[PDB]
Amino acid sequence: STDYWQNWTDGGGIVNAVNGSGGNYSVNWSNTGNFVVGKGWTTGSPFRTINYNAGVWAPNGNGYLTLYGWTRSPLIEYYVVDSWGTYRPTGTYKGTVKSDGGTYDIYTTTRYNAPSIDGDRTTFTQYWSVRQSKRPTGSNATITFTNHVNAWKSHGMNLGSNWAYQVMATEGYQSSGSSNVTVW
């Protein structure tokens, strides 16, 4: 069961986000700038298995349906992207990993003097696993986070020892869309 509610907007356009019952949330948006909404856990774990069902996945423009989280020591921002809208997110290619029936490209990016959970102007690395093709939604789905962590480990991408939030997120930008996700 989830204990955390991520809900950030830069205030552009309309973002109606609903904190639903238990692990359920929905987002309806139009003409946005940028937002991140998700349910998960206050303290992420590298051994978590994240189950979710995206009843609705309806972006018109950019948006990611993605595991999203942070660690400290060191500071790391991470993403496991299952589906997206118009454009697929990429970066510096590092390798691949098969997990949960899909195959994912692995990317890093360095973020300089940028916002983090720790501060305004902060330097850190970003880890991505991005599914090579959009993952079906509407059915019960699993993200075995360990598979990613391990593949990331093998390409010199180590996560921190202090774990912060870890959510199944809807990220949207310069777009409109709907999302309905149930997490556990």
Binding site: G33, N34, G61, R111, G119
Partner: protein, 364 residues
């Protein structure tokens, strides 16, 4: 082809530079009509070149070989100088990545080394990016037979991007739906202006005289990291901003002693952090064209010391409220960081795409 240079934010000064030639950089001045620099240790003054050169007098300087008056936009200092040919050394590009080396012959003023005061280490002068005939984008346009147009992606850190000459906007994953707002040319100014019709803080819309936000009432600059504001706008915007901040059992923000030149500062131990920066109210500049220019914490708050961040709205001094001769708002550098900006001086429109939180101009 268009010409690409990488853009470094100087940590000490906060000014943005591009490589010029021989380990030397220039400060980007989006209101500056001249390319100028210190010179190696013959234009007539009645010529069109010389008139272009003195078309916009520098504030503290008046006016037979040609003499320009290079302006340090940080110090406000100016001095006499002769025009001279020099090399802008960069890469060509067809989107955002380097194709190959290229030397562009550009006219630049020669400045006495004392005008380097207040500028970044490694900088031997200023690349003016204003809408005038001897600014760098115009000169590159004629020299290279490309568009009088340029792209800025000012970075928070790491290498950002400056492309002179236009062609298609790269990074369609962030730029495909890029909104435009007219560029307004103001008499006797080469600076780039745009028009805002509303400011919104949180959900609360700010009350300014209908038409204190007039046509071309917003200027863009890279001289200061913060926003400068006319008093009829400053007081209402800051009232609404501090209130929305106070009303946000999470820790309430504690004001500390103002630091020069800011008016309102805060203990950072008492500010939250979200994906947009410090957890302060979002701010929405409603620009002509129906799309907003948004500021999050990363844009509306400046770190000054360890422990202290100040509100990046500063009141203009020596100016009467509601005085149409001055811009109501002067957006600065931290408010333009992590935006892709297409300054198109041929179609006279500014394209502005706000990059989403997970990426930035730096390293793009």
């Amino acid at each position: 082809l268009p010409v690409l240079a990488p853009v470094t934010k100087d940590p000490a000064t906060s000014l943005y530079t591009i490589p010029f030639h021989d380990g030397a950089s220039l400060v980007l001045d989006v209101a500056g009509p001249l390319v100028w620099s210190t010179c190696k240790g013959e234009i007539p003054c009645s010529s069109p070149t010389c008139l272009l050169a003195n078309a916009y007098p520098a504030p503290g300087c008046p006016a037979k070989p040609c003499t320009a008056y290079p302006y340090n936009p940080v110090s406000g200092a100016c001095a006499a100088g002769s025009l001279s040919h020099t090399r802008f050394v960069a890469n060509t590009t067809d989107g955002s990545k380097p194709v190959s080396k290229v030397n562009v012959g550009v006219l630049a003023a020669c400045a006495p080394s004392k005008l380097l005061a207040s500028l970044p280490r490694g900088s031997t002068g200023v690349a003016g990016l204003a809408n005038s005939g001897l600014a760098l984008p115009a000169q590159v346009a004629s020299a290279q037979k490309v568009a009088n147009r340029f792209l800025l992606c000012l970075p928070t850190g790491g290498p950002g991007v400056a492309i002179f000459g236009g062609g298609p906007v790269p990074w369609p994953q962030f730029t495909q739906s890029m909104p435009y707002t007219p560029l307004v040319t103001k008499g006797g100014s080469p600076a780039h202006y745009i028009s805002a019709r509303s400011i919104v803080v949180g959900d609360t819309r700010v009350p300014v005289p209908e038409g204190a936000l007039a046509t071309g009432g917003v200027m863009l600059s890279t001289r200061l990291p913060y926003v400068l504001l006319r008093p009829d706008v400053y007081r209402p915007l800051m009232d609404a901003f501090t209130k929305a901040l106070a009303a946000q059992g999470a820790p309430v923000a504690r004001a500390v002693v103002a630091v020069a030149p800011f008016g309102v500062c805060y203990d950072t131990k008492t500010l939250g952090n979200n994906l947009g920066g410090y957890a302060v109210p979002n701010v929405q500049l409603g620009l002509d064209g129906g799309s907003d220019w948004t500021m999050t914490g990363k844009n509306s708050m400046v770190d000054v010391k360890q422990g202290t961040a100040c509100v990046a709205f500063v009141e203009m001094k020596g100016v009467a409220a509601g005085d149409g001769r001055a811009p109501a708002v002067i957006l600065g550098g931290a408010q333009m960081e992590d935006f892709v900006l297409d300054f198109d001086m041929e179609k006279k429109r500014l394209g502005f795409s706000r990059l989403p939180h997970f990426t930035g101009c730096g390293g793009l």
